[PDB]
Design an enzyme around this catalytic site. Structure first.
Site, short mmCIF file in Angstrom:
data_model
loop_
_atom_site.label_atom_id
_atom_site.label_comp_id
_atom_site.label_asym_id
_atom_site.label_seq_id
_atom_site.Cartn_x
_atom_site.Cartn_y
_atom_site.Cartn_z
N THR A 24 -1.63 -4.84 4.07
CA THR A 24 -0.36 -4.96 4.77
C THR A 24 0.51 -3.74 4.49
OG1 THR A 24 -0.32 -7.40 4.71
CG2 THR A 24 1.80 -6.26 4.84
N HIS A 177 -8.51 -14.57 7.37
CA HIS A 177 -7.76 -14.53 6.12
C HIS A 177 -7.66 -15.94 5.52
CE1 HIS A 177 -5.34 -13.30 2.93
NE2 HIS A 177 -4.52 -12.45 3.55
N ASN A 180 -5.41 -15.48 -0.86
CA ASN A 180 -4.09 -15.07 -1.34
C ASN A 180 -2.95 -16.04 -1.05
OD1 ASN A 180 -5.41 -12.83 -2.36
ND2 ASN A 180 -4.93 -11.54 -0.57
N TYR A 182 -2.33 -18.11 1.39
CA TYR A 182 -1.80 -18.30 2.74
C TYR A 182 -2.26 -19.63 3.34
CZ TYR A 182 0.18 -13.72 2.08
OH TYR A 182 0.90 -12.66 1.57
N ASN A 237 1.24 -15.80 -4.40
CA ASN A 237 2.06 -16.71 -3.60
C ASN A 237 2.17 -18.11 -4.17
OD1 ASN A 237 3.05 -14.88 -1.55
ND2 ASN A 237 0.89 -14.71 -0.95
C1 LIG Z 1 -0.11 -2.73 -0.28
C2 LIG Z 1 -1.09 -3.88 -0.30
C3 LIG Z 1 -1.19 -4.73 0.79
C4 LIG Z 1 -2.11 -5.78 0.80
N1 LIG Z 1 -2.17 -6.58 1.92
C5 LIG Z 1 -3.25 -7.45 2.02
C6 LIG Z 1 -3.54 -8.07 3.25
O1 LIG Z 1 -2.89 -7.82 4.28
N2 LIG Z 1 -4.61 -8.92 3.31
C7 LIG Z 1 -5.35 -9.23 2.18
O2 LIG Z 1 -6.24 -10.09 2.23
N3 LIG Z 1 -5.08 -8.61 0.98
C8 LIG Z 1 -4.04 -7.72 0.90
N4 LIG Z 1 -3.88 -7.02 -0.28
C9 LIG Z 1 -4.94 -7.10 -1.34
C10 LIG Z 1 -5.99 -5.99 -1.20
O3 LIG Z 1 -6.80 -6.21 -0.05
C11 LIG Z 1 -6.91 -5.95 -2.42
O4 LIG Z 1 -7.46 -7.24 -2.62
C12 LIG Z 1 -6.18 -5.51 -3.68
O5 LIG Z 1 -5.52 -4.28 -3.46
C13 LIG Z 1 -7.12 -5.33 -4.88
O6 LIG Z 1 -8.12 -4.36 -4.60
P1 LIG Z 1 -8.05 -2.90 -5.29
O7 LIG Z 1 -8.17 -3.10 -6.78
O8 LIG Z 1 -9.18 -2.08 -4.74
O9 LIG Z 1 -6.70 -2.34 -4.92
C14 LIG Z 1 -2.96 -5.97 -0.28
C15 LIG Z 1 -2.87 -5.10 -1.36
C16 LIG Z 1 -1.94 -4.07 -1.39
C17 LIG Z 1 -1.90 -3.11 -2.55
#
Ligand SMILES: Cc1cc2nc3c(=O)[nH]c(=O)nc-3n(C[C@H](O)[C@H](O)[C@H](O)COP(=O)(O)O)c2cc1C
Length: 370
Positions: A24, A177, A180, A182, A237
């Protein structure tokens, strides 16, 4: 198996096993993707698969400001430019079709309404909203209203519409989705679901909604273009489940019968420790995967959360996972695939520009030369 070699996720052919996790970014005012959004995704098209930022199936499914949706004609047109761009650059892309459930605010809802949820339990969470008069956060999420059976039917239809819209916009498929904290997880997990009807209580009942969504989406666009994201233990959440193993093993036993393209698993707390747990017992990710495989599940197993180059390479080589999705590293590294292939340095993500704003911290992270 190499992290860099091709893979198959149902009907979708992947160039490599490096996936861009859904992120996001809140840079689509009016729920309509724009030219800058197209630039952003095109920059990252060397990913084996891009999963978009969460994109809601309806306004009711919106929980944050300036998030692109799949419910306006203009949004479908905006997405089409994005998928065309990604495809022309040799990529593949799926829409993360989203409903936030209780994680929203009246100002974002149709009719200024209460967010909807399986039970009327307010989340102690916050939403990104744009001050009427400037500009950006924060409000406590609003008190939600408990869904009726009829309401649930309307949401299922919105998932059908959303999946249809994703295909019209030229996506290769969708990721439901279901993670998280939702809407779908609100039904799944005990802290958020106190229903006394067929959608509450037993594991079977709590997973009912998830499975109806999957079946609706798969019927519309094909199981081979349908994936789903799950997050068994995440505290995101304000959600809690004390006994996730039987619940989640049941979920994937059922998904294993449905010929899906991929299962995307957040391992641990989202953005936090991989070994996070809520209940008394640690979650067994191998048992979880086995429950999927032993039911006949053949989807690509995509893992996420806290991976880096070495852990991703090792996890794919051993066959523990089929592919790895990277979140924050993809924010900061449009050419992450090439950087990982060459074991080059990475750019660091700048957290303050993750959400909202402009090109800075979005499209201006540099690729390496040549
Ligand atoms: C800025 C940001 C936005 C995110 N938005 C979503 C999202 O829209 N949908 C989702 O399932 N997870 C979202 N997450 C979780 C990421 O998909 C991911 O699970 C999380 O960053 C951990 O992975 P990483 O260690 O590679 O960063 C978001 C994470 C970040 C940092």
């Amino acid at each position: 198996t190499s992290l860099f070699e091709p893979a198959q996720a149902g009907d979708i052919a992947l160039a490599n096993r490096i996936v861009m996790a859904p992120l996001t970014r809140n840079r689509s005012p009016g729920a309509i993707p724009n030219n800058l959004n197209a630039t952003y995704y095109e920059q990252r098209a060397t990913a084996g698969l891009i999963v978009t930022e969460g994109t809601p199936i309806s306004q009711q499914g919106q929980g944050y400001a300036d998030v692109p949706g799949l419910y306006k004609r203009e949004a479908i047109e905006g997405w089409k430019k994005i998928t065309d761009g990604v495809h022309s650059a040799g990529g593949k892309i799926v829409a993360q079709i989203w409903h936030v459930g209780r994680i929203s605010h009246t100002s974002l809802q149709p009719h200024g309404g209460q967010p909807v949820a399986p039970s009327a339990i307010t989340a102690k969470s916050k939403t990104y909203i744009i001050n009427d008069d400037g500009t950006g956060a924060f409000a406590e999420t609003s008190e939600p209203r408990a869904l009726t059976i009829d309401d649930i039917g309307l949401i299922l239809e919105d998932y059908r519409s959303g999946a249809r819209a994703a295909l019209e916009a030229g996506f290769d498929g969708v990721e439901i989705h279901a993670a998280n904290g939702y809407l779908i997880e609100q039904f799944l997990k005990s802290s958020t679901n106190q229903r006394t009807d067929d959608y509450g209580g037993s594991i079977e009942n709590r997973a009912r909604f998830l499975l109806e969504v999957v079946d609706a989406v798969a019927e519309e666009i094909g199981a081979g273009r349908t994936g789903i994201r799950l997050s068994p233990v995440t505290p995101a959440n304000d959600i809690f489940e004390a006994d996730p193993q039987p619940l989640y093993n049941y979920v994937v036993e059922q998904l294993g019968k449905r010929n899906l393209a991929f299962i995307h698993v957040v391992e641990g707390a989202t953005g936090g420790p991989r070994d996070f747990k809520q209940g008394d017992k640690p979650f067994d990710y191998a048992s979880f995967k086995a429950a999927y495989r032993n039911a006949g599940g053949k989807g690509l197993w995509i893992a996420n959360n806290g991976y880096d180059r070495q852990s991703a390479i090792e996890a794919v080589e051993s066959g523990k996972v089929d592919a790895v999705a990277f979140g924050k590293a993809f924010i900061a590294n449009p050419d992450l695939v090439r950087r990982l292939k060459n074991d080059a340095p990475l750019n660091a993500p700048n957290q303050p520009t993750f959400y909202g704003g402009g090109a800075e911290g979005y499209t201006d992270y540099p690729a390496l030369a040549q």
